[PDB]
Symmetry: D2
Subunit: 116 residues, 4 copies
């Protein structure tokens, strides 16, 4: 698939399941367009939210509700949420894997961009 948002829980060493993820495309006057949304789910090595629509050149935003994830575990995380804002400047068809490694006081996000 064209887009894969993986969310990992670094305390537990498991995919953070049931996490809300909102994907947005930038528009005129900072207007953010809703591109795709959903929640993390797994089966074998698929531990995230995937979408089928490819990414045409532009600026996208990925919102991850990391606050809600930690509250369910009785924890008040530092970050109010996780946000990944990037440019899909390669207009040609590309595959984007976006990962977020979560900890109560820290998060990491990594992107792997491959061209089929």
């Amino acid at each position: 698939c064209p887009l894969m948002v993986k969310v990992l829980d670094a305390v537990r060493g498991s995919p953070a399941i049931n996490v809300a993820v909102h994907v947005f495309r930038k528009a005129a006057d900072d207007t953010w367009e809703p591109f795709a949304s959903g929640k993390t789910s797994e089966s074998s090595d698929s531990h995230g939210l995937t979408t089928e629509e490819e990414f045409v050149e532009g600026i996208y935003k990925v919102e991850i509700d990391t606050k809600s994830y930690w509250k369910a575990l009785g924890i008040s995380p530092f970050h109010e949420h996780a946000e990944v804002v990037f440019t899909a400047n390669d207009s040609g068809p590309r595959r984007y894997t976006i990962a977020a490694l979560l900890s109560p006081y820290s998060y990491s996000t990594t992107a792997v961009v491959t061209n089929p």
Copy 2:
């Protein structure tokens, strides 16, 4: 509020990195709060702001993009941000440490009883 930024490709502190701040408004939108850039001098490798810190939902942006472009590298992220609630339970001393690479970054909060 302190913000330390490290460059993982050069193994040194991210020099002259732009950093902006935003205090949340009653419309769930943002309003500017503070600014500055990562200034280097010995062991001081971050941006140390002076502005006192009201309780409230904040947003710290680090212009990673401009930083990498200047190094002839085309980065993935437009920027690196950290949205956190600041002093909702007495004064707290914050230090936001960021580790940067063209395709990934980590932001870690170090909170301390002032």
Copy 3:
């Protein structure tokens, strides 16, 4: 059973043809070969997947990150990337070890399933 992913944080892509050797501890400072090979790429497969199953015990994953960088004209800080851990201490599990490489930095994450 075991999957080792190696990513280049500077290019945002799998680091391919990277040598990975896995060992099992047999005594203080004594490692038995478990499996080895190179990161192979093909569509969504960007790492090294081994067929061998772990038995309970301590294992070491050696990743030759130095050769990867030298092949680029870069003299990296780390001589290699080692990952030592205890496996199956609670039963048959699937391990996915990820190593993210930057010339002056590297991070390793582990995802253990079911």
Copy 4:
């Protein structure tokens, strides 16, 4: 010349009293102890500052991340965290190894300055 700073990504604070054992590659390709220490906190200086000074060569820094996590009732993935590297290969330089820790993940970054 050699400093080791460790952050706890779970508690959002430096990792205090983390054991750190530095070795030096021996002529016969072995590991001879080089430094002794535990992350000490004072002011914001939480890491460990070793007095010993190096000469060109390969070194190994082992951070007992496991004892740290166990003390917090958490069974971590790694037996430890280590950083092997060739130092002063092009002239004496100052090194600071920053380690960011979580039970199932960790990173180590080298901040090398030109004296």
